[PDB]
Design a protein around this nucleic acid. Sequence first.
DNA 1: TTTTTTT
Lengths: 1238, 529
Amino acid sequence: AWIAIDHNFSRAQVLTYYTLQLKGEHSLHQAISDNDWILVLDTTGNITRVGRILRIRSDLETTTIFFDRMLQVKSVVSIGITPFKFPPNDRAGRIQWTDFIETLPKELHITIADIPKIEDQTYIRELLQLAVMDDLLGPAGGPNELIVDMGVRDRYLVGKLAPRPSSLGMTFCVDGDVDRVEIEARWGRYERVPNDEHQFFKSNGQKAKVWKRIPCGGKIVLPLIEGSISHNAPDSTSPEVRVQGSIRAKNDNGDRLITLFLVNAQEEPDTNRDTAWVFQPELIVRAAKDAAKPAIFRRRPVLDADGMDPEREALEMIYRDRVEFAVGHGVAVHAEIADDVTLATEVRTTVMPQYEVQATETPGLELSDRPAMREMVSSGLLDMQRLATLDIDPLVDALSVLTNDYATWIDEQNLNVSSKAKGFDTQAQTAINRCQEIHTRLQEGINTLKSNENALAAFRFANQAMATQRIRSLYALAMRRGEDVTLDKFDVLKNRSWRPFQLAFLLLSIPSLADPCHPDRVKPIEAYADLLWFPTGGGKTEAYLGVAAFTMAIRRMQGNLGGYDSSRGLTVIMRYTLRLLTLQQFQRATALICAMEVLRREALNKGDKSLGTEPFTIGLWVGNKVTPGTTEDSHNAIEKTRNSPVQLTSCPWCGTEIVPGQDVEVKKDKAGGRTFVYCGDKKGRCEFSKGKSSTQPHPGIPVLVVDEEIYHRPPTMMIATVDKFAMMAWRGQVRTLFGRVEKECERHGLLWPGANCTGNHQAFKGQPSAKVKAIPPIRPPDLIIQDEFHLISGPLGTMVGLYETAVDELCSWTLNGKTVKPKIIASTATVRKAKEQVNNVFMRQVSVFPPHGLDVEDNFFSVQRHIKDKFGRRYLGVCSPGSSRPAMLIRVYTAFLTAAQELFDHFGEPADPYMTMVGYFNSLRELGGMKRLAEDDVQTRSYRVQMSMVERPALAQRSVNNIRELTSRVSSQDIPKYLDNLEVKFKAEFDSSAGKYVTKWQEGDTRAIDVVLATNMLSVGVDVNRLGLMAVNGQPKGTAEYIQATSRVGRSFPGLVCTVLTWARPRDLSHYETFEHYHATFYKHVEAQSVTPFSPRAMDRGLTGSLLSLMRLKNNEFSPNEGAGKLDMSNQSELAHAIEVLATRAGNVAEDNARKLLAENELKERADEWAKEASKGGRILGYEKRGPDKDKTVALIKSPGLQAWDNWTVPMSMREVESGVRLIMDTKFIKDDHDWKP
Amino acid sequence: NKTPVGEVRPSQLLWTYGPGALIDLPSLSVVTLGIDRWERERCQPIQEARLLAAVRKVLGPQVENLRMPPFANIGVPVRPFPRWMRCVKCGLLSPFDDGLLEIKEDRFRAERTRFVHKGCTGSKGNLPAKDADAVPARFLLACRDGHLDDFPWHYFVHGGNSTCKGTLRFFESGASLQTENLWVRCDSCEASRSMAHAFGKAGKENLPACRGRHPHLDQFDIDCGEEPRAVLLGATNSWFPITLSALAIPQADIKGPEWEVLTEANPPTDYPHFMSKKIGTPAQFIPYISRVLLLERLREVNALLGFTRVEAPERPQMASLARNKPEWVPANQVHGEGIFIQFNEKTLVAWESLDAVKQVDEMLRGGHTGWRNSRNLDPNEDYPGIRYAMLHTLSHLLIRELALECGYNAASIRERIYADTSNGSPQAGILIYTAAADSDGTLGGLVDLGKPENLGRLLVQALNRSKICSSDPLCSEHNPEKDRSLHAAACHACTLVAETSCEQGNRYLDRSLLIPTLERIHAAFFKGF
DNA sequence: TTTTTTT
Ligand SMILES: Nc1ncnc2c1ncn2[C@@H]1O[C@H](COP(=O)(O)OP(=O)(O)O)[C@@H](O)[C@H]1O
C-alpha cells in the first residue's frame, strides 16, 4: 500500500483516466511492485482515486503505472480524518494495511470486493500495442535491464546496427533565416557480467551467462556552411560512432537541404562479438536554445517536371493542410507541427511507426451538426412509410428542405476563396461551379415529380417496397438464428428511414427514366453516365436498388409506345466480375423481388389493375459448373439427391429451412419443362408455401436458375457475370433477352429458329390442342448497372470495353424517328482519371456524385469526425533489413497470440475482438507454406513461452488447436455455417480460487477458432461484429485493394492493422520510408489505369467475336447453326451496316484516324475471308459440328487450344488463362549399396 | 503404381522447378525426373531454326527438335525427396522405405495426399495406435559439382561409423526464443548432439565426404573431390538454370542481325509478327536519344540447356539433362510487345574520354581480374566494357521505375542490352518487353507509356530517386578491387531486381556512371537531372 | 466440355 500525489503530467485524456505518472528514476521507487493498492491525493490534501497496479513502465526520468481496477472518490474529503501522514517531498510512502482496511468502509463506504473493473476497449487496444512493442523492440525490463541465459542479438528483432546495414539517416529542409541547429542522439549498449557478482544457476548448478545494459547519448551544435559535415562523436566513452552528412546550396525559394547519417564504426572482437553492436537508436533535431523562433522546418520541394492535370491540381488543393516535412533512409520519420500548419518545430526518426485514421459518417446525430439535418432527423421527414401517404404539396414542402440547405451551403462556400484558398483560386471556382450544377439537377427532379402522375405512383410504389423489404429482412435473420421474437418488435422508426445521399441520388435519377424523350437518352453527345463514389460501408447498394425498383414500376404504366410491348420482358441488367459476389448479391435482391410480388398480388385483389397481370421474376446467368444448363440435369440432380437447382438455403420471406429432396418439383419434359421451389412451412401460413401459391402463374419462390427456363420466359431482373456475355457468338438463342421475338407457343412460351417446338400440337394426355400465334416485339431493357468499376481496367477492362460495342447497340430502339439508348449507372470506391476510362469503355460523358467542395474533411453529405469524439483504425509497421520472412512471421504471430491471452486473463470477455486473428496473404503458395509453420512451430513456441529462464514480461501461456483456411476449397453448404462458426465467442467464467478468468468447455460444446487465413479476398458475406485484429503479409499490388481489405475489420469495435514489409522489394521499402505520410493522404496515391481497345493485340483476339456477336443476334437468316453459307449477294448488303458501326465506334473512341484506317482494313479482311468460304459448294457450311448432318458438315470457327491462333479463333471468356500441367508420382522402394566414409 | 499429386503452370517449367529441382508442395516435396523418361511423342514441336543453330552448336549436332511441355495418367513424372521424415506427435525420425511410414491418398482428389506414421503410440508407447501426420526433414547436404543427398544423421549422431540400430528423436532445445539450438537424441545408446556443429568452419571436422548422387537420374558417380556443404530445405541457392533465347526476325551471333534490323531507316512490315511505330522523342532528352521505336507485335522463344547447384554460372559445372547426349530440349514461346531506345554515338564517344570514366574503368577492370583468378580462369578475357555497365545500370533503374509508378508486377518485364563495340559496328541501345503471355500490359498497356509525354516523366522520376540510397555512406565508398566484387555502389536496396528479368545476373553495375553521387561527381552522363 | 482467379 503506497501513497502518491497527483500532478497531471500527461496530456492524452484516455491515458490520464487510467494511468499515473511519476518523475524520477524507478530506482527511487523500487519498493512499488505488481498487485499493490495505491491511493492518490491532490496538491491540497484531498483524497481522489484508488487503484490496483497491473504493470510498471520506466524511462530515464519518468515512470508510467497502469491499472486494472479503479474507483473515484467524488466528495471533497480532507486527509486529516485519516491517521495517515502527508506524502513528504511528493514521494511514495508506505500505508498501514490494517488502518487502510478499517478506513475503507468507515469514510469511503467501500470494500475490496466492491471495486469495479475497467471496461473501455481503447485502453485494451493500447495495452496490447505496448505489450507487442516491448517484445519486438525493447528494452523489456527498463533502462538497466538484465538478459539471462541467451545472446542479446537474437532476443530482439528490429532496430540494431552492426559493426563494420550499419547506418541510418534522414533528409529535411531548413529555413534560410537561421544559421545554427541542435542535434541529439541516443542508443543502448550491453556488457558481459563477470561470474562472482551474479547468482543465477542452471538446474544442475552451473553458472549462466548474464549481460547488463548501460545507456549512452549526447548533444552537439552544428553551424550551417555549404559543404560536407564534419565528423563528430556525441559520446566520449565510445569514440568510434559517427554522425555525418552534407549541406547543399540555396534553392530559388531560399531554403537549404540537409542530409544526415548515423554510422556505427566499431571493430569486431574475436570473443563476445555482441559488445560491438548498437541497439535502439534514435535521432532528434531541434532549433537552438537562444533562437528567436522555434519553427524553422519547411515543406520538402515539389520537384515539378513540366506536367499539368486539373485532377492532380485539385488533389493538391484539397490536401493542402497536411504537409510532408521529411523523408527517411532506412528508418521512418515523424514531425511535430506548430500552430501554423505549414511550419514544423522538431523532426525525429521512429523505428516502428504508428498512425490513426479518422472515420467518416453521415451527419444528423450529433449536437454540432447543421440545424437543417437535425430538424430533418427529428421531424421524421426521412421515413419511407410516411412519404407514401402525403399529398403533393406537403411532399414538395418536405423535399424542398434538402435543396434549400444545400443552396445555402454552396453560397457559404463561395466567400472563402479569397481567404482560405490562396494559390488555388482557379481550382476553387471550378469546384464551386459543379455544386450549382447538382443543385440545378435536384430542382429539375423535383419539377419532374410535380407535373407527372405516373412518376408519383412509381415513387410511392418504390417507397413502400423498400420499406417492406427493409423491415422484413431483419425478422428473417433473427428467425433463422433460433431467436424467439415476433414481428411487432421490428416495426420502429429507426429501422425504416432514409439516409440523405440515397434520397438525393434517387431524386437525381428520376427525370432520365420517367420520359424517354429527355435529351440525356436521345442524342449521342453529352450523354451523362452517373458515377457514384463513397467510403465502403455507406449504403450504395440500397441506393441503386431503389433506382432499380423505380425503373421497374414506371415501365408498366407508360403504355405501348412506338410499336413495342412494355407489359413484360427484361428491364435491368446487373453484372459483376467475381462469381462469389454474384452469389451474395442474389440473396439480397430476392427479398426486394418478393416484396414487389406481394405488393402486386394485393393490388390486383382490390380491383386495381394498373400493375398488370404478369409477375415479377429474377434470374441467375452464371457458368454451368454452378447452374444446370438443361432441365434433364435439373431432374437428375433431384433424383440423385433422394438416394444444382437449389441455390437458396433458407426462405427469404420467413426464414424457414429448405429441404432439397422434398421442396423441389420438376415438371415432366417431352420437349421442355419448368422447375419450381416451394417454402418449407409445413403448417402453411407463408405466402410462398405449397398450400397457397399453387393457383398463381408462377408458384413458389419467383427465381429462375435454369438457362433454358430463363430463355423461354425472360425475367424482370438478371444478375450475371461479365465472362458469360462472351457466349453470344456461340449460341443464338440469347436474342430473346434483347427482345428479338416474333412467335410464341401456348404450351411452352417464346420461340427461336431451330427450337424443338413449332407451336402446333395435337391433343395429348387430355390437354387441349393449340396452334402458333404471332406477337409484336418487346421493348429492350432500360437500365444497365456496373459495380466494382475500378476492377474494370487493364487486360480485363480492354475486352469488357471491346465487347460493349454490341451490348450498347442491341438495346437501341426507335421512337418517333429518334434513337433511344439505355441509362448507365456505375459505382466504385475510388476515382482516378475517370474521364478517359468512362469515355473508353462506355463512350459517355462522366458525372461524379457527390462533388468535392473546398475541403477533404467537410462536404454537405460526408463529415469526417475527430479522434476526440470517435475512435479510428490504427495502423502499425514492422520492417527489418536482412531477416527472412518466416523468422519475422513466427515471432509476430507468437507475440500477438500470447499477448491476447494475457489481456484475456485479467479483463475477461471485452478481450474477445482481439482473441481470434485474421491473416491476409498475397499468393496461394505462400499461404500453403505458412500453413505448415502455423501448425507446428507457432503452437510449440506458444506452449513454451513461460518455462525458460529468459524473462518475457507481458506474454502468457495459450494452447492453439483450431486453424481454418478460408479459400476456394470449401463447398457452399458449410460456408454460411463457417460464417456462423465465427459467431461464437470465447466463453469464460471467473475462477475465484485462482482469481482469473478461464475458458471451461462443457460436454460436446462448440470450440472457437484461433487462427483464420484468407486469400486475395475475404469472405465479405456479412458484417460480422467480432473481428477486430488483422495482419497483412506484404504490401498488395494496388492501393484500392489495400484500402478495401483492411476496412473489413474494426467496424463495431476499435481496430488494429499491422503490416509486415520486406526489405528487398521496392514497393515495401518505399512505403516503409514514407509510412506516416502515405496513410494520411490515401486518395492522392491511387495508381494509374488504362483501357485501350482497338490496339492491334486486342484486335487479333476480340474483333471476330464482336463482329459475329453483332451479326448473329440482329438478323433471322444468320441466327441458327445452318445460317452459314447463306451469305450471298442478295444478303451481303446487311454486313456493311455492322462493319460501319464497328468502325464508327472505333473512330469515336480512339479519336485518331490512324486507328480507324487499320480497323477498317482488318474488318474488310475478315469480311472477304467469310465471303470465300460460304461460296464453297458440295457441302453444308455450319458454325459448329452439331446435328445428324455432322457427317457432311464443316465448322467455320474454332475454340482456343493446342493449335496456333488464327483469324477465326473465338474466345469463350473475357480473361485469358493458361492451362496447367499435372504431376505423376512414382512410389517405389530404393535400396542402397553405398556407404559413408570419412 | 502411380498416382497424381498436384499441378503447376507450364511457364515455370523453364525458370523455377524442372529437372533436378525440389518442388515444395503443400504436403511433401518431390524431384522431377530426367527428360529421358518423358513422353517424347506428346510434346508439340516449336519451329525456330535460328535458335536451333545455336543449341546444336553448344550441345552437339545430334539434337533434333525443340518441344513444348506435355499436355488421367498423363503428366510430369516425379519422385519423393528427401527420404527422411519426422513424425510430429512422437518426434520419431526414420526413412520412408523402412516400412514405418505409409501413404494416405485419393486418386480423384489428389491434393489431400500426405504421409502418416502408421500406428503411432506416442513417445512412450502408451497412446492408442493411430496414424499421425508427419513432416519431411529440414536439412540436406549439397555439393558444388552438382551432387545432392540427404543429411547423414546416422554418421553425425554417433561421431562416425557405428553398430547401433536404435531410433532417433528430435527436440526444440527447450527454450522458445531459440531457433539456433536443436537436439538429436538416440533412444538406445542415449547419446546426444546439436545441429549447430554442422555449420561454420566446424562442418569440416565433423561432416563426411560427398557420395556422388544424382537423384533425378538415379545414379552414383565413382568419386567426387569437392568439399560438401550443409544446406537448409528450400534454400535459394539450391538450383540455378541455364537459358538461351532469341527473337523472331525476317530474313554468326544471335544479337547481331537484331541490331542490324532494328537500326534500318525503313523497318520491314511483311512478317505477320513484326510491326513498329516511330513516336517522337522527349524534349528534355534531345541531345542524348536519337530514335525511339515502339513495337506492337513481337515474338520470342526460349530454351533450357542445363543447371548448376550452388553458385551461379560464369563449362565443367553444368549438369546434364539425360544419361546420353540428349535428342531434344524443352522450349517455350511468348507473343508480346516491346520498346526500343537508341542513343547518340558522338555523345557517348565524347564522354568516354573523361578522366573519371577511365578511373572507374580501371577500378572495375582490377576487380574483374581479381574475381576471375579466384576460380582458376583466364583473367584477360570477357570484359564487356564500361558502356555496358552504364547501359546495364540505366536498364535496371528504368525497370524498377516501371513497377514503382504504374503498379505493375515485378516479374512481368524482361530486358536485353546491345553494347558490342569490337567488330567495327558499334552498338548503343536497350530493349524492354513483356515476359509472359498473361502478364500486365500485354493488351497494348506497355506501348501506351512510349508516348513522349510519359517516357520523359518516367526517366526524370527514375533519375531523381537514385541520388541517395538507403545505405548510402558505405554504398558509395565500396571498392570492387579490394574484395574482388563485380559491382560497385550498387547494393540490393537500390539496383537489383528479381532473377527472372536480369540478363547477366546482377553483375557490372555502377550508378555513379549516370548521376553525381556523394563521392564521384565528374563521371556522370546525365547532368542537372 | 465450358466458364473464371490469380503471379
Ligand atoms: N437506410 C438505411 N438505414 C440504416 N442502415 C442502412 C441503410 N442503408 C444501408 N444501411 C446499412 O449499410 C450496410 C450495407 O452497406 P452496403 O450498401 O452493403 O455498402 P456497399 O456500398 O459496400 O454496398 C448494412 O449493414 C445496413 O445496416
